[PDB]
PDB file of C-alpha atoms in Angstrom:
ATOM      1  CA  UNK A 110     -68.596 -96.247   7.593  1.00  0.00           C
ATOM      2  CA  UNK A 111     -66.116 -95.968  10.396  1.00  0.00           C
ATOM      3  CA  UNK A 112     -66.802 -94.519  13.783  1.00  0.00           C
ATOM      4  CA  UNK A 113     -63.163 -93.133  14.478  1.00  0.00           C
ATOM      5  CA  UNK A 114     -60.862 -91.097  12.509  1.00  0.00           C
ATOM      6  CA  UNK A 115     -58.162 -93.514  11.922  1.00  0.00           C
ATOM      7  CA  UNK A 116     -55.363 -93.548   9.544  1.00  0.00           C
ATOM      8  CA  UNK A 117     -56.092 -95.587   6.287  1.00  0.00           C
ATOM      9  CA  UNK A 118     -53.152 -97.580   4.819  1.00  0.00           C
ATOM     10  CA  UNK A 119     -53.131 -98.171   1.498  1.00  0.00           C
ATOM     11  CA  UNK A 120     -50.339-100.901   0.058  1.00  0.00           C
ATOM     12  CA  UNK A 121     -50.343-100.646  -3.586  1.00  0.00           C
ATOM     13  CA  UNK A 122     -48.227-103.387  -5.649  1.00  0.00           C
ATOM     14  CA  UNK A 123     -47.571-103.816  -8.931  1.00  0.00           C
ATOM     15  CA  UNK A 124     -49.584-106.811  -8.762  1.00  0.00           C
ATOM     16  CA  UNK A 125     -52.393-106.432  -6.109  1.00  0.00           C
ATOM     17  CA  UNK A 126     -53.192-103.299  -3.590  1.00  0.00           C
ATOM     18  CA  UNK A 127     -54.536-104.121  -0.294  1.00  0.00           C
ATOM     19  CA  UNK A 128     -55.848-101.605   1.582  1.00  0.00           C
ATOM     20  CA  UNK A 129     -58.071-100.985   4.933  1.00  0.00           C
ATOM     21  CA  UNK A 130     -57.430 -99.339   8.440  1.00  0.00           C
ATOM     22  CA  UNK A 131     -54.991 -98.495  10.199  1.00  0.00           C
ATOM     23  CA  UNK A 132     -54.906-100.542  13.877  1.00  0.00           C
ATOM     24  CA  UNK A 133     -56.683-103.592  12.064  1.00  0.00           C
ATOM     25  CA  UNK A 134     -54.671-106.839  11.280  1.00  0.00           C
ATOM     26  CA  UNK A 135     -55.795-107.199   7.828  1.00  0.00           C
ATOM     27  CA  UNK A 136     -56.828-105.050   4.646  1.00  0.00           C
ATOM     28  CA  UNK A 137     -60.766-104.614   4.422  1.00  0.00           C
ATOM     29  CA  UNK A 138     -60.891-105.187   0.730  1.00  0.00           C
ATOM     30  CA  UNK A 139     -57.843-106.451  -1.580  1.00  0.00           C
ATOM     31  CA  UNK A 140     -58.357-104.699  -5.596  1.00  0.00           C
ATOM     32  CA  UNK A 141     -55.994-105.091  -8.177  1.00  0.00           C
ATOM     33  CA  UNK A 142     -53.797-102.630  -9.212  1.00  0.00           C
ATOM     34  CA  UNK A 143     -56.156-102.749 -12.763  1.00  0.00           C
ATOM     35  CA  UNK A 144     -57.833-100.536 -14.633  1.00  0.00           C
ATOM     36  CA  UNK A 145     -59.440-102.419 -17.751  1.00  0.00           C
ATOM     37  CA  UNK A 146     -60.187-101.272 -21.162  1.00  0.00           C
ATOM     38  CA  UNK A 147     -62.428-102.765 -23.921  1.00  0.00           C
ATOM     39  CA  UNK A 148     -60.749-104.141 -26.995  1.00  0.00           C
ATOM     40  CA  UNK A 149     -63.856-104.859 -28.700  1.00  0.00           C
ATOM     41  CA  UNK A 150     -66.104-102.594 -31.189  1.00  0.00           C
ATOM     42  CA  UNK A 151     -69.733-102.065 -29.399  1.00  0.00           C
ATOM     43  CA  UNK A 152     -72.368-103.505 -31.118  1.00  0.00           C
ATOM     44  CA  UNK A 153     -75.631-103.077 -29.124  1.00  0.00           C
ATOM     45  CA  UNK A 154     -77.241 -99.778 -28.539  1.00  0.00           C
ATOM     46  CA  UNK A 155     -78.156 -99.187 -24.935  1.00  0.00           C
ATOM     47  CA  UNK A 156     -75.691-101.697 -22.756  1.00  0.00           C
ATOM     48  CA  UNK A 157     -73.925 -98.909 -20.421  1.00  0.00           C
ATOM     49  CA  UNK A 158     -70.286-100.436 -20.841  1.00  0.00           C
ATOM     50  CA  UNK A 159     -67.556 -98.190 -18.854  1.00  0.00           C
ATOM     51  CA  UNK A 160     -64.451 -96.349 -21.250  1.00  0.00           C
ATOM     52  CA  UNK A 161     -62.292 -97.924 -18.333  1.00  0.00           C
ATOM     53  CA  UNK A 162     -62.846-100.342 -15.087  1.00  0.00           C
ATOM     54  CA  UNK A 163     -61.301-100.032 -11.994  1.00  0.00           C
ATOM     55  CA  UNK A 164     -60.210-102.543  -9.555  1.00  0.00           C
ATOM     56  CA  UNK A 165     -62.452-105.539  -9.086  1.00  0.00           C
ATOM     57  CA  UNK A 166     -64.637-104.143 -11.840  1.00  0.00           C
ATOM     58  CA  UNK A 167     -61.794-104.569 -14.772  1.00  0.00           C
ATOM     59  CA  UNK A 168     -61.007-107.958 -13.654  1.00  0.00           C
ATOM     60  CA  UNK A 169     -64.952-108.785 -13.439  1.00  0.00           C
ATOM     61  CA  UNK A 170     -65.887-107.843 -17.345  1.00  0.00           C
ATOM     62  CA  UNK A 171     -62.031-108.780 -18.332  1.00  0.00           C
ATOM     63  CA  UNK A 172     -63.290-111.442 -21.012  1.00  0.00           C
ATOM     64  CA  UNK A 173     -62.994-108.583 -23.398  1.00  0.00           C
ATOM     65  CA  UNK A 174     -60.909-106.056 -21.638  1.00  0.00           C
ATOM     66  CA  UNK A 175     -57.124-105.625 -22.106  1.00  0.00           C
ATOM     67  CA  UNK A 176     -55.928-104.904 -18.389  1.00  0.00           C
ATOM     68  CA  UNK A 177     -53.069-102.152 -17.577  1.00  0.00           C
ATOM     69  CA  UNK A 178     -51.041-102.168 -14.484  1.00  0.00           C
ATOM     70  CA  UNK A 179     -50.004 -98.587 -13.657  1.00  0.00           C
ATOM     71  CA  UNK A 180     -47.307 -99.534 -11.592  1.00  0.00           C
ATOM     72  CA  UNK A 181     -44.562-101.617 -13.417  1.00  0.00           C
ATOM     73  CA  UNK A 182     -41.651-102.782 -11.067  1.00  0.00           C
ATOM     74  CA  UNK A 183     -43.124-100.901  -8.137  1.00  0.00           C
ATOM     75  CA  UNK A 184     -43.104 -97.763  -9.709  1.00  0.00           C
ATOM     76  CA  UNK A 185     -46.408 -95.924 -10.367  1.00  0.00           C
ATOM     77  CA  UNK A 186     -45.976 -93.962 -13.677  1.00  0.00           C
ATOM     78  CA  UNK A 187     -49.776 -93.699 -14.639  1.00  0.00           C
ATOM     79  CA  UNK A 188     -50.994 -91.397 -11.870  1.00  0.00           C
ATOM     80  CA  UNK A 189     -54.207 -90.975 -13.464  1.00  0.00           C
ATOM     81  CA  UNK A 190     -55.160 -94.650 -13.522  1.00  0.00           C
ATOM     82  CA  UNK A 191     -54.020 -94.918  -9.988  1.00  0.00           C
ATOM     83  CA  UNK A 192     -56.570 -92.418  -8.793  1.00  0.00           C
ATOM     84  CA  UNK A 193     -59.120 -94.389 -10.105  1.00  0.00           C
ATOM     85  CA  UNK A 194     -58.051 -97.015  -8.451  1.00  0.00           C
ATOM     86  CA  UNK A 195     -57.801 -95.007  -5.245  1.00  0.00           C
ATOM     87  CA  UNK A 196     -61.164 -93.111  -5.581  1.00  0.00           C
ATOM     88  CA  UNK A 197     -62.835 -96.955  -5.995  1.00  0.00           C
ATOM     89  CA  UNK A 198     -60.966 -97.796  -3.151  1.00  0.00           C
ATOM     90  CA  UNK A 199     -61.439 -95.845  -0.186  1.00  0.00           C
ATOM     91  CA  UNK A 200     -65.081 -94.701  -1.213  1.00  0.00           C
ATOM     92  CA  UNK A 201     -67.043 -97.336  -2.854  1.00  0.00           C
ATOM     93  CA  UNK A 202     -65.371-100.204  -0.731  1.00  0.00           C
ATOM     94  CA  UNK A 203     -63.565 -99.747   2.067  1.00  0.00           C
ATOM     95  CA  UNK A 204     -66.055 -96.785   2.806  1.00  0.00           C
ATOM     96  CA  UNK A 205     -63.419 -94.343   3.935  1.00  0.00           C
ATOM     97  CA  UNK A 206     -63.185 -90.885   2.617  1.00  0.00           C
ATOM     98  CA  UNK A 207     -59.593 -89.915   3.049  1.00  0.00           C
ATOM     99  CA  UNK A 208     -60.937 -86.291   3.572  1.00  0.00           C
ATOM    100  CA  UNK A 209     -61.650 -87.464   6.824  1.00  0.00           C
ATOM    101  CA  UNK A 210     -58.488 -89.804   7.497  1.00  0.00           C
ATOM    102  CA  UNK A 211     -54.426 -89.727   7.298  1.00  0.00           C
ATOM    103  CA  UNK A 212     -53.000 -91.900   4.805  1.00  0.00           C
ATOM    104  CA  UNK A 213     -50.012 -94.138   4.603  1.00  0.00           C
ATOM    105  CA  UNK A 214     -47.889 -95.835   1.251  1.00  0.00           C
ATOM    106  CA  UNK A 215     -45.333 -98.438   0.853  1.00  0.00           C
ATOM    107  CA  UNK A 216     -42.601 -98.284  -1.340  1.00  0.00           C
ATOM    108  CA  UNK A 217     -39.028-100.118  -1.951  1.00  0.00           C
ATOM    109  CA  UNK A 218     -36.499 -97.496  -0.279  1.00  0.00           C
ATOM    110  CA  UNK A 219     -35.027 -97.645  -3.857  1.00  0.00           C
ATOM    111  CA  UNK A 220     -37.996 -97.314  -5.590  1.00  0.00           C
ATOM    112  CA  UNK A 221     -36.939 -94.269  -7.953  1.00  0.00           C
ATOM    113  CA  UNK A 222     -38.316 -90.836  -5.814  1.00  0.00           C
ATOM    114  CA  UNK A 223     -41.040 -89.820  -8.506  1.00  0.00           C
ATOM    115  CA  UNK A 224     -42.809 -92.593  -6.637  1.00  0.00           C
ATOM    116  CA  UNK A 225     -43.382 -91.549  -3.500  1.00  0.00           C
ATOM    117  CA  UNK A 226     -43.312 -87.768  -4.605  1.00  0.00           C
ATOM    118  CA  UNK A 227     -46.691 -88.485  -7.302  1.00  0.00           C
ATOM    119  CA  UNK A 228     -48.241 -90.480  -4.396  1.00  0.00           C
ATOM    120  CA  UNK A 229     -47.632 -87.854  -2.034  1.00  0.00           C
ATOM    121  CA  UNK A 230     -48.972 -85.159  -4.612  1.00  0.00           C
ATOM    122  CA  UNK A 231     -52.279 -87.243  -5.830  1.00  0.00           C
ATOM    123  CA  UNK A 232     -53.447 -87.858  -1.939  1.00  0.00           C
ATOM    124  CA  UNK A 233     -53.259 -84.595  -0.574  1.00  0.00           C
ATOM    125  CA  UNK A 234     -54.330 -82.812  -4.115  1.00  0.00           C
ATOM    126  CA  UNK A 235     -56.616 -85.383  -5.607  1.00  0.00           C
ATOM    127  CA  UNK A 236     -57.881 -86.807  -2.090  1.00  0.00           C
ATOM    128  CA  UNK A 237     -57.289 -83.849   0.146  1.00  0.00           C
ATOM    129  CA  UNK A 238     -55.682 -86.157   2.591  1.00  0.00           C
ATOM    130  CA  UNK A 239     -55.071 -84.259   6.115  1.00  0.00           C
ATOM    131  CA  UNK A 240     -51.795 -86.178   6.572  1.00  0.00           C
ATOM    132  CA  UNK A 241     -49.757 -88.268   4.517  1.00  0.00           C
ATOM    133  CA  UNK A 242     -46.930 -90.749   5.136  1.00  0.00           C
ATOM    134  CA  UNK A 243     -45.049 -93.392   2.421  1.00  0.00           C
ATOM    135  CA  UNK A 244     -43.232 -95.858   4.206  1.00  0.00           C
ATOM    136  CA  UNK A 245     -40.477 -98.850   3.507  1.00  0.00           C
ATOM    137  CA  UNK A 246     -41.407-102.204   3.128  1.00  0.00           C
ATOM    138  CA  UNK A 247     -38.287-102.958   5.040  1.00  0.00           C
ATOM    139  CA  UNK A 248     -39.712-101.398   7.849  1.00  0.00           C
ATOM    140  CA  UNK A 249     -43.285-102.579   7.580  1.00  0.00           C
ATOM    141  CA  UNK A 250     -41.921-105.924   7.043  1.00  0.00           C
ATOM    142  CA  UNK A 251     -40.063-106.312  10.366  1.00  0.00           C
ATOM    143  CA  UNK A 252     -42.764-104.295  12.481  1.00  0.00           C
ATOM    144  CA  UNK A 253     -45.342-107.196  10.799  1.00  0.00           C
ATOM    145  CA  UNK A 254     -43.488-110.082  11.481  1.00  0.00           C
ATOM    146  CA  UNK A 255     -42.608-108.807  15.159  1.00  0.00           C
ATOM    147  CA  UNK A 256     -38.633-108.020  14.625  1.00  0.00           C
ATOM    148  CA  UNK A 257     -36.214-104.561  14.855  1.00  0.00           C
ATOM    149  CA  UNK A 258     -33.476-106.871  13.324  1.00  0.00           C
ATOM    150  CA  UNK A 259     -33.272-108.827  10.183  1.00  0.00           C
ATOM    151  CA  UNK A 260     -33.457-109.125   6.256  1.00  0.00           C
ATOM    152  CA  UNK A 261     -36.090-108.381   4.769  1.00  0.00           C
ATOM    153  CA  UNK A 262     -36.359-110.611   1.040  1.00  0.00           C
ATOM    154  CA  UNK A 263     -39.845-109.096  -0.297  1.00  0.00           C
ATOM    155  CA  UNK A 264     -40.401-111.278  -3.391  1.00  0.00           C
ATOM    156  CA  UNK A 265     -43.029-109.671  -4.175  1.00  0.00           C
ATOM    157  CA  UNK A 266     -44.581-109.269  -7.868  1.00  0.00           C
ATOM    158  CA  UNK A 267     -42.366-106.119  -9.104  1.00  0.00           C
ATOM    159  CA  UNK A 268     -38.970-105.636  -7.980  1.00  0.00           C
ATOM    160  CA  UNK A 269     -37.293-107.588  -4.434  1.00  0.00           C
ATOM    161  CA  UNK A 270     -35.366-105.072  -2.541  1.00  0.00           C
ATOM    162  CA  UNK A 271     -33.393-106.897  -0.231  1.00  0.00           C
ATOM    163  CA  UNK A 272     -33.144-104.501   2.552  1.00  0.00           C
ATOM    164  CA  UNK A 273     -30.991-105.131   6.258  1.00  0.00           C
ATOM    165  CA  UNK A 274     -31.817-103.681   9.271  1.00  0.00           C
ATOM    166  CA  UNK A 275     -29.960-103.810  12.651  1.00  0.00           C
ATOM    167  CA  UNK A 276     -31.427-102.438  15.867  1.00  0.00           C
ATOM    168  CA  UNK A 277     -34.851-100.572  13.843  1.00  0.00           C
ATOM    169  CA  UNK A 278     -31.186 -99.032  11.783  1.00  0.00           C
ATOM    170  CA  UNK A 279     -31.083 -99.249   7.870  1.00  0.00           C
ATOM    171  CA  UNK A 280     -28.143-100.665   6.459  1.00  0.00           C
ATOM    172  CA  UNK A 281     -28.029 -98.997   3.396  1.00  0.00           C
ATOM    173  CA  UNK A 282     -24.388 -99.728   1.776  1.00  0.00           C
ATOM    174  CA  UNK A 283     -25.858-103.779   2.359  1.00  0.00           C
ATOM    175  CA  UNK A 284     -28.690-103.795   0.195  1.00  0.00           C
ATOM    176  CA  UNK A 285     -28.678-105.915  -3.013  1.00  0.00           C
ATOM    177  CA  UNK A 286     -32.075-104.580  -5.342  1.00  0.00           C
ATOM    178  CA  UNK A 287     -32.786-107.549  -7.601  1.00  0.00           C
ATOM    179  CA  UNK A 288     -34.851-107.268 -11.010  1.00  0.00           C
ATOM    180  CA  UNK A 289     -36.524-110.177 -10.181  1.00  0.00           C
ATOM    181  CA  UNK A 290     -40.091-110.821  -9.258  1.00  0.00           C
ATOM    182  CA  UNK A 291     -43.441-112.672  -9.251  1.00  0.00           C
ATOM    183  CA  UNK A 292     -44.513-111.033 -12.475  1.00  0.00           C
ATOM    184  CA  UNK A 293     -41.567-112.559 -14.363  1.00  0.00           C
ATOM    185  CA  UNK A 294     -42.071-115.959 -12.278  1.00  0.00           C
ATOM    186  CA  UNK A 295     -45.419-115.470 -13.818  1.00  0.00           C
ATOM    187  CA  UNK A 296     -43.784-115.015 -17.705  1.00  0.00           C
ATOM    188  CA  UNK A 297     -41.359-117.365 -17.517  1.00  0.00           C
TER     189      UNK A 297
ATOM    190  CA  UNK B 157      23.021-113.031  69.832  1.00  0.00           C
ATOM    191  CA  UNK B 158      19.648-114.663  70.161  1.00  0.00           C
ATOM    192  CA  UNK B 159      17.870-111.327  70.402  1.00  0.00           C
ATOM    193  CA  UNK B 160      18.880-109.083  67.586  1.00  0.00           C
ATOM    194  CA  UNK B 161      18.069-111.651  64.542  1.00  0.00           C
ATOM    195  CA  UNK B 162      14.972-112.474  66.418  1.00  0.00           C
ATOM    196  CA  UNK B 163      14.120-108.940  66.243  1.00  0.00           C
ATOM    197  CA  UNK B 164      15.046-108.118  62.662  1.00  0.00           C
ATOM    198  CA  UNK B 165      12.656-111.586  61.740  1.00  0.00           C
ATOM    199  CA  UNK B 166      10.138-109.613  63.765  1.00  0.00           C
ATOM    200  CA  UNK B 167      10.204-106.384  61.704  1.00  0.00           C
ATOM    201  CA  UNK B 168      11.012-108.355  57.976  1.00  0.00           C
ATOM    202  CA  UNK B 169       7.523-110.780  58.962  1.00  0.00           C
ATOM    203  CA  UNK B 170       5.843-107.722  60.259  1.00  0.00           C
ATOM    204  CA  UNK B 171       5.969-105.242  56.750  1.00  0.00           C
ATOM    205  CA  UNK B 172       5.617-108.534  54.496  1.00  0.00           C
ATOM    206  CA  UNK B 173       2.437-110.009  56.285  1.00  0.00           C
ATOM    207  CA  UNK B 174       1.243-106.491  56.937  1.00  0.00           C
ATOM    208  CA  UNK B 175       1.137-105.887  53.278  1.00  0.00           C
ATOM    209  CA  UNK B 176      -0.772-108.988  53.139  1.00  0.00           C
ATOM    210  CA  UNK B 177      -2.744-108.279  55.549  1.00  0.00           C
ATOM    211  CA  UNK B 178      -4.110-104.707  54.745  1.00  0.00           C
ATOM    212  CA  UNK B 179      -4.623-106.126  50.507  1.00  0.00           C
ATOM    213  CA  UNK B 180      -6.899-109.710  52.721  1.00  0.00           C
ATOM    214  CA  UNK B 181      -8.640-106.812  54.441  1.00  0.00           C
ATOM    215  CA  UNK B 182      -9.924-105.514  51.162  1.00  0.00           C
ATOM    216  CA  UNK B 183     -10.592-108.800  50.313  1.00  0.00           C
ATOM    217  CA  UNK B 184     -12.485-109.708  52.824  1.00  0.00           C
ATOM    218  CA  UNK B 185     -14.333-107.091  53.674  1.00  0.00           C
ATOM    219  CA  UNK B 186     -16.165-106.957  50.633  1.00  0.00           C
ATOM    220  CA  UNK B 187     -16.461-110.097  48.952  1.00  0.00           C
ATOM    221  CA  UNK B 188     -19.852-108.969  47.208  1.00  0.00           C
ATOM    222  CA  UNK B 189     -18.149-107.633  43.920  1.00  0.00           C
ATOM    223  CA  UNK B 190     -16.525-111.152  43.749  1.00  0.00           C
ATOM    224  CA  UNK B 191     -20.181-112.866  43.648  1.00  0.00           C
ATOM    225  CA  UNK B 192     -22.260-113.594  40.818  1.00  0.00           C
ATOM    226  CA  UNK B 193     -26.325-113.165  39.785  1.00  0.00           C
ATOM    227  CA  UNK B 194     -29.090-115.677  39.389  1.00  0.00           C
ATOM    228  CA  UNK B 195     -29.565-114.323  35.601  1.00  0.00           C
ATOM    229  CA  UNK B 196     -33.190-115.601  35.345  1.00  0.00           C
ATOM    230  CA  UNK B 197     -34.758-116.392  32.583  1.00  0.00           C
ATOM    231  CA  UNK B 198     -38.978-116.002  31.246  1.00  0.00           C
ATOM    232  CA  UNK B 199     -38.267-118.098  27.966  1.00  0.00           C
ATOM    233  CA  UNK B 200     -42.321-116.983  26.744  1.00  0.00           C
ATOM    234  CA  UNK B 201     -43.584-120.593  27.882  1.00  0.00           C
ATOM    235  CA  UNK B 202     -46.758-119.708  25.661  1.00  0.00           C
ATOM    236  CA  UNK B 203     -46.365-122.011  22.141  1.00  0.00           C
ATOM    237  CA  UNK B 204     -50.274-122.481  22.714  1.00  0.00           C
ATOM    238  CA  UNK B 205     -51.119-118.983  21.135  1.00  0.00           C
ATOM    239  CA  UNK B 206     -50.595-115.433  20.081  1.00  0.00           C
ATOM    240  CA  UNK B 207     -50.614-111.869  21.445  1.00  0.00           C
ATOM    241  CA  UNK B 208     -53.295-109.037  21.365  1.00  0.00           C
ATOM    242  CA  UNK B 209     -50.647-106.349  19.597  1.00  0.00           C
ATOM    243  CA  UNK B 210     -51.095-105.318  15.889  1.00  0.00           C
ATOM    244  CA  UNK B 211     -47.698-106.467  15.103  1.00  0.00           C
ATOM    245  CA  UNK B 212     -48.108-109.561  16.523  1.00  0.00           C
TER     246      UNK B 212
END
């Protein structure tokens, strides 16, 4: 639905992924990072009822759906649930086939490689992306909040990594990754 | 004897404040790299609202 072949950013947490545009100053659409599953034995003959729901769906029919996160500490390891998630994402909300648009990912710089290498893999296989680019939440944290210098604390809901940069320069021997986050706040 | 000392106070005066006088003629024909700048400052007088730019 847009008129200009613009990159589409896609920032996929362990508890939320917001996605839209690039150039814009907000996502278009926030989803979960969900896809839902009943837990119940149908009874009535003729009610449609999904195997799995995706997104905004799974939370929507949750009172009898058990709901998986397929990224746990900002890792994705379920690949498959996470194309749902994408497929639901770019073409039955945000209205953006990334057929037709370059695509950028976030990730902790210490977020264990398989990450950005099965994101990387799903968009231009899955999605056949024209371009692809997964970027550092250190970075995207300082170009957001209008620095080159600083500390970037993410507490975010899977796993803070604590980054420094100095001058748009990582400071890699500096940073402190903490197995702490919103999801535990959320247990505890 | 009043002309030879007077002479030799000539020559000692001459080389001492000729020294000086060739290192005040550096000085003081440029006295610019002495000086100083204005160092202005534009201090974003604008705590009524925000920028145009993505990142802002």
């Amino acid at each position: 639905d847009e008129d200009e072949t613009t990159a589409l950013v896609c920032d996929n947490g362990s508890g939320l992924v917001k996605a839209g545009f690039a150039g814009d100053d907000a996502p278009r659409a926030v989803f979960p990072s969900i896809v839902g599953r009943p837990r119940h034995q149908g009874v009535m003959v003729g009610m449609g009822q999904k195997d799995s729901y995706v997104g905004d769906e799974a939370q929507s029919k949750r009172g009898i759906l058990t709901l998986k996160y397929p990224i746990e500490h900002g890792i994705i390891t379920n690949w498959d649930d996470m194309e749902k998630i994408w497929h639901h994402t770019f073409y039955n909300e945000l209205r953006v086939a990334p057929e037709e648009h370059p695509t950028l990912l976030t990730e902790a710089p210490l977020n264990p490689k398989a990450n950005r290498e099965k994101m990387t893999q799903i968009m231009f296989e899955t999605f056949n992306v024209p371009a692809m680019y997964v970027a550092i939440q250190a970075v995207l944290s300082l170009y957001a909040s209008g620095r080159t210098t600083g500390i970037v604390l993410d507490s975010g809901d899977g796993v803070t990594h604590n980054v420094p940069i100095y001058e748009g320069y990582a400071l890699p021997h500096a940073i402190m990754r903490l197995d702490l986050a919103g999801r535990d706040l959320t247990d505890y | 004897m009043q002309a030879l000392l007077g002479a030799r106070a000539k020559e000692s005066l001459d080389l001492r404040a000729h020294l000086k006088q060739v290192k005040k003629e550096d000085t003081e024909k440029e006295n610019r790299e002495v000086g100083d700048w204005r160092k202005n400052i534009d201090a974003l007088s604008g705590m009524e609202g925000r920028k145009k730019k993505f990142e802002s």
